[PDB]
Design a protein around this ligand. Structure first.
Ligand code: OW0
Ligand code: FE2
Ligand code: SR
Ligand code: SR
Length: 325
């Protein structure tokens, strides 16, 4: 492969990462309190779990994966229409909600073996959807329905989390969940998987992420890496760095990466929900005491975002400047 994609030695993936047998798989059609308790335990101990019987239509999950795969099968001439000034966009602020193709990497500078389609999804209006891909013809109809359903499920999970923490229901149903970025990630086959990464190890910087996958490649850091079993009808829930801060580290964030495959391509669909760039992030005051003093000072989400997107020297580089006590 091109030297551009060669990861530094220490960041390269080992060839035989074991299945995470202890990744919680949570049935949302259990009794209400059982769901609250199992979600709370997974958030406290792991920061990554799967949800099944989650109420989002399996047909809609299949139709969305279909139209996302159809998008990445489009010819160059169509994909150029989402490359500002002839090039993929960068994950840097301002992060606009109009649809673009994105390149990603670390600055021993290297690129991730990944093409990403990203756009905002909330609130859904004519202007936003008109900024989405024109092809395939059904993308806008399908992804509009998908985005509304994934948000519905994410807000249910956040309210289970509220009940587990002892926060009032709807605590996150405000500026803290105003941004909904849908990242469709395309990992083409890689001739040298031993040297490349689909994505380096990271927390998602936002509040919470729901991830739809049907093929292997997602791994979690627990410093042992484990493989997250693809369940095509499930969502992987990744707790974000923002939720780690707001819970005053009562909850773990998900540190995850994606490895490349030499033979087959992979598409994943990540719905990243989190604060507006104008938000102030701090540990929830309702949970603080002399026994539980704040571990972070209040900070600008915009200021955090700039560091999070640029500085990859450590997983929590984004929040290091705001650590106290
Ligand atoms: C692999 N990268 C990581 C970093 C990057 O994430 C983002 O762009 C999110 C989008 O809301 C973001 C969160 C907080 C602040 C700013 C930006 C793109 C992908 C994704 O998995 C994360
Ligand atoms: Fe991620
Ligand atoms: Sr180009
Ligand atoms: Sr347009």
């Amino acid at each position: 492969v091109s030297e551009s994609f060669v990861a530094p030695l220490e960041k390269r993936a080992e060839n035989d990462v074991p299945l995470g047998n202890d990744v919680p798989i949570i049935d949302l059609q259990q009794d209400h309190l059982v769901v609250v308790q199992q979600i709370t335990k997974a958030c406290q101990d792991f920061g990554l779990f799967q949800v099944i019987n989650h109420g989002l239509p399996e047909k809609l999950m299949a139709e969305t994966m279909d139209v996302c795969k159809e998008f990445f099968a489009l010819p160059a001439e169509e994909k150029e229409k989402l490359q500002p000034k002839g090039e993929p966009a960068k994950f840097e602020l301002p992060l606009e909600q109009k649809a673009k193709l994105y390149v990603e990497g670390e600055q021993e500078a290297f690129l991730y073996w990944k093409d990403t389609l990203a756009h905002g999804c909330h609130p859904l209006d004519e202007e936003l959807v008109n900024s989405w891909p024109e092809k395939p013809a059904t993308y806008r109809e399908v992804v509009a329905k998908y985005s509304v359903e994934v948000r519905k499920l994410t807000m249910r999970i956040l309210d289970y989390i509220c009940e587990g923490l002892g926060l009032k229901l709807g605590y996150f149903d405000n500026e803290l969940s105003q941004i909904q970025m849908m990242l469709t990630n395309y990992y083409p086959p890689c001739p040298d998987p031993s040297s490349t990464l689909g994505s380096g190890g990271h927390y998602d910087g936002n509040l919470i992420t729901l991830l739809q996958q049907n093929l292997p490649g997602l791994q979690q850091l627990i410093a042992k890496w484990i493989a997250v079993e693809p369940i095509p009808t499930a969502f992987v829930v990744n707790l974000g760095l923002t939720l780690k801060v707001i819970t005053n580290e009562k909850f773990e964030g998900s540190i995850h990466r994606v490895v490349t495959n030499p033979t087959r391509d992979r598409v994943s669909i990540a719905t990243l929900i989190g604060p507006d760039y104008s938000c102030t992030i701090e540990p929830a005051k309702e949970l603080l005491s002399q026994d539980n003093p704040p571990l972070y000072k209040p900070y600008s989400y915009a200021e955090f975002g700039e560091i999070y997107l640029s500085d990859k020297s450590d997983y929590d580089a984004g929040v290091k400047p705001y650590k106290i006590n």
